[PDB]
């Protein structure tokens, strides 16, 4: 099972389930202002990709030394843990576990 | 299957295939100038480690708060997405999917 969604503020999250492991890819570009420590409310990670424990996905902004993280809690309501931002190209590939 | 190659600019990429998942370790140090958004032309990632979709591998520069990312496209010709850099020790252990 595969899924893609524009989480909020222009950030896209692409997901692929492989057994107890979810593969992810942070996409898109920050098109509106995203508050520090805010919920990404446009899209929720569907149930089948939701972890038992909160996953902190470390990403990088294209063209600089800037990093951020997006949390995927069990609810699928992702959170942005970078500072308040209104521009940039977020990227980051990896995996996170499920049960 | 394991592989290591100096991609370009002194950056080493170490890979280990485990089913449909590739385990990575960024090594080496920047020995020459690497342009922002440039191709790493010294060594290409071998076919057996090349993903179906473009993978963004996040890393960190030793001693500071600086982060970067290297994308592995399906061709294996890696692209650096940090800013223009000519120094630093790049590190980072993670995974990316083959699929």
């Amino acid at each position, epitope marked *: 099972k595969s899924w893609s969604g524009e989480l909020g503020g222009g950030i896209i999250l692409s997901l692929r389930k492989k057994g107890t492991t979810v593969e992810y890819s942070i996409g898109g570009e920050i*098109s*509106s202002s995203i508050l520090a420590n805010s919920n990404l409310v446009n899209r929720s990670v569907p149930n089948e990709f939701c972890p038992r424990n909160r996953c902190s996905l470390v990403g990088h902004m294209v063209g600089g030394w800037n990093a951020f993280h997006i949390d995927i809690p069990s609810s699928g309501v992702c959170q942005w843990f970078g500072p308040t931002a209104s521009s940039g190209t977020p990227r980051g590939t990896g995996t996170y576990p499920i049960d | 299957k394991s592989w290591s190659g100096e991609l370009g600019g002194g950056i080493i990429l170490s890979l280990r295939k485990k089913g449909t998942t590739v385990e990575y370790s960024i090594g080496g140090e920047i020995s020459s100038s690497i342009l922002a958004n440039s191709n790493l032309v010294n060594r290409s990632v071998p076919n057996e480690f090349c993903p179906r979709n*473009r993978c963004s591998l996040v890393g960190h520069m030793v001693g500071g708060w600086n982060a970067f990312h290297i994308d592995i496209p399906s061709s294996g010709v890696c692209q650096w997405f940090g800013p223009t850099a000519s120094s630093g020790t790049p590190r980072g252990t993670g995974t990316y999917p083959i699929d």
Partner: nanobody, 117 residues
Framework: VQLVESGGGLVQAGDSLRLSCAVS?????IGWFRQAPGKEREFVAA????????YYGRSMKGRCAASRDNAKNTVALQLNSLKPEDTAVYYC????????????????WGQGTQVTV
């Protein structure tokens, strides 16, 4: 893959223009980019060919819409509330990947089409 941009020309402030992008092959996602002379290239919009999913960049949010006419083998970018600032050459691009916004992340490119506002 092969890409050809149609439509585009001179128009005034507040007007609308429908750009076309003819595509041949075999890509899944068709991207839209714009570059004004002496300015940074910008991502405008992306549309999946199989699905009809769209994504819009920072540059023309709320004043542009991408669509596909799946035969014709076309993707079209509609621009509204046009202002002389949206004056640039509009490019069409192709990739297997969603949701890519960088020029570097696109494999096949079109000649472009000038849009003067």
């Amino acid at each position: 893959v092969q890409l050809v941009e149609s439509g585009g020309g001179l128009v005034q402030a507040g007007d609308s223009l429908r750009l076309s992008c003819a595509v041949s092959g075999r890509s899944n996602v068709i991207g839209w980019f714009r570059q004004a002379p002496g300015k940074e290239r910008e991502f405008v919009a992306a549309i999946s060919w199989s699905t009809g999913s769209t994504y819009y960049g920072r540059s023309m949010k709320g004043r542009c819409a991408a669509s596909r006419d799946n035969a014709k083998n076309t993707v079209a970018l509609q621009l509204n509330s046009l202002k002389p600032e949206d004056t640039a050459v509009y490019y069409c691009a192709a990739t297997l990947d969603w949701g890519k916004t960088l020029s570097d992340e696109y494999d096949y490119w079109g000649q472009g089409t000038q849009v003067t506002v």
